[PDB]
Amino acid sequence: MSDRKAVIKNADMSEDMQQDAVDCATQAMEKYNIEKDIAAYIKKEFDKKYNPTWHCIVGRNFGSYVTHETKHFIYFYLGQVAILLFKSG
DSSP states (O other): OOOOSOEEEEEOSOSHHHHHHHHHHHHHHHHOOOSHHHHHHHHHHHHHHHOSOBOOEEESSTTOOSTTTOSEEEEEEETTEEEEEEEOO
């Protein structure tokens, strides 16, 4: 039935993260499902490629650290899950 794994509610990043994060979350959730390891492969990919310091979340909205730093975030909801990637300036 109706059930996808990608829904951007609001993207403030340069889109690249929408494609990267979504695919990182798609390849991470399909390749794995540890939940924690997922956020690591996402933060790791963006950390060892775009240099720190980001902070992606995988759950609902428990991040509470988006604007707290700057304004470099990117929201995207997954099937029965939520993820938010953000970094400081």
